[PDB]
């Protein structure tokens, strides 16, 4: 492997915050051969920025990629005045060191 | 010691006739009301012109699990449900 054996990609997760609707995040984990891999832990961290430039850190969430589609799912519930949601997903495979875990960051925006 | 329901504070809300007007939701002073939009549990403090709202808990889907959600109803019937067969 080089850097990491896993590649993270969002599926069915548009980076747009819709008001009054929960925000779902679905992450797929592939290998170097573009093959889905299940049973991989995925930890999600998030941070919200509102209209008053105030910052809120969420509690980390954990999911596992399924064996039928290699997808890990999260659902976040955000306050009403949130404009930006900066989140990141990282693998936590028990056979990989900390430095060799796949990590990816995304930024969802509210309408403007 | 995890926290499930997160709370936030909306400041500078409009106060009319002793009630908070929060996103077309009327909440009389010192009352706790379950809302549909947003799907939160709100409480008005008209003297400080603030509204304290509790959110639905965030869900991390486990193996063999899914999420059942509907926007209809007030809190907590509109919260996403972490449904795993049992």
Residue numbers in the entry:
A (entry chain E): 347 to 458
B (entry chain F): 2 to 87
Quote what the paper states about this structure:
The 3 pathways all converge at the activating cleavage of C3 into C3a and C3b, and the subsequent activating cleavage of C5 into C5a and C5b. C3b and its inactivated form iC3b function as opsonins for phagocytes, while C5b initiates the terminal pathway by assembly of the pore-forming membrane attack complex (MAC, C5b-C9). To address the need for a more detailed understanding of the mechanisms of C5 activation, we have identified and characterized a family of C5 inhibitors from tick saliva, hereafter named the CirpT (complement inhibitor from Rhipicephalus pulchellus of the terminal pathway) family. Analysis of the specific binding interactions between C5 and CirpT1 suggests that the CirpT family functions by direct steric blocking of the docking of C5 onto the C5-convertase, and our data thus provide support for previous models of C5 activation, which include convertase binding through C5 domains MG4, MG5, and MG7.
To understand the interaction between CirpT1 and C5 in greater detail, a complex of CirpT1 and C5_MG4 was crystallized. The structure of the C5_MG4–CirpT1 complex was solved by molecular replacement with the isolated C5_MG4 extracted from the C5–OmCI–RacI complex. Initial phases from the partial molecular replacement solution produced a map into which a model of CirpT1 was built de novo, and the complex refined to give the model described in Fig. 4A and Table 2. CirpT1 is made up of 2 domains: A bulky N-terminal domain and a flat looped C-terminal domain. The N terminus of CirpT1 extends further, however, and engages in a 4-stranded β-sheet. A detailed analysis of the binding interface was carried out using PDB-ePISA. This revealed an extensive interface that encompasses most of the C-terminal domain of the CirpT1, with additional contributions from the N-terminal strand and 2 residues at the tip of the extended loop in the N-terminal domain (Tyr23 and Leu24). The interface is predominantly hydrophobic in nature, with His7, Tyr23, and Asn59 on CirpT1 contributing sidechain hydrogen bonds (to Asp405, Ser426, and Asn423, respectively). Overlay of the C5_MG4–CirpT1 structure onto the C5–OmCI–RaCI–CirpT1 structure revealed minor clashes between CirpT1 and the neighboring C5_MG5 domain that were resolved by a small rigid body movement of the CirpT1 into the cryo-EM density. This placement of CirpT1 in the context of intact C5 revealed additional contacts between CirpT1 and C5_MG5, including a hydrophobic cleft between C5_MG4 and C5_MG5 that Trp70 and Pro72 of CirpT1 pack into. Of note, the stretch of residues from Cys66-Glu69 in CirpT1 extend over an extension of the hydrophobic crevice between C5_MG4 and C5_MG5, but leaving a hydrophobic hole.
